[PDB]
Amino acid sequence: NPKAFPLADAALTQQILDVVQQAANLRQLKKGANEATKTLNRGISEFIIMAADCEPIEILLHLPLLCEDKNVPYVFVPSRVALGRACGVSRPVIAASITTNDASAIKTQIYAVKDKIETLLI
Amino acid sequence: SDAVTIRTRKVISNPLLARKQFVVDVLHPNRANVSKDELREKLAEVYKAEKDAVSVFGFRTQFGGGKSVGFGLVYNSVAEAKKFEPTYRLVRYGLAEKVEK
Amino acid sequence: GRVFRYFGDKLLISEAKQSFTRVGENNLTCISCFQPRLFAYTVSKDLQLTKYDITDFSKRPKKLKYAKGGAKYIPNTTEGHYDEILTVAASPDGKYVVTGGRDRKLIVWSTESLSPVKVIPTKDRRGEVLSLAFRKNSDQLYASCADFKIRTYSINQFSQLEILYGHHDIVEDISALAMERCVTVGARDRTAMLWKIPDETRLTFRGGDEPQKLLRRWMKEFFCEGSIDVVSMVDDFHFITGSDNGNICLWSLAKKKPIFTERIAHGILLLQPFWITSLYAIPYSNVFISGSWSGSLKVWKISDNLRSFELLGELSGAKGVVTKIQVVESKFRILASIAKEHRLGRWIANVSGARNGIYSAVIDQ
Amino acid sequence: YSTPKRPYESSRLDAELKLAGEFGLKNKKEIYRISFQLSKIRRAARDLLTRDEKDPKRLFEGNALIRRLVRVGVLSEDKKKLDYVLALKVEDFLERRLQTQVYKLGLAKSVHHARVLITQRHIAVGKQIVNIPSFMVRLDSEKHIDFAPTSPFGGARPGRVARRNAARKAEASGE
Amino acid sequence: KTEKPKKPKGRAYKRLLYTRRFVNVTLVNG
Amino acid sequence: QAIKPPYQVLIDTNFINFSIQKKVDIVRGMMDCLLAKCNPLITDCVMAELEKLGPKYRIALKLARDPRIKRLSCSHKGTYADDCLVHRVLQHKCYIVATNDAGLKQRIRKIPGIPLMSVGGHAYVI
Question: What is the CATH code of the structural domain delimited by B5-101?
Answer without folding.
Answer: 3.30.70.3370
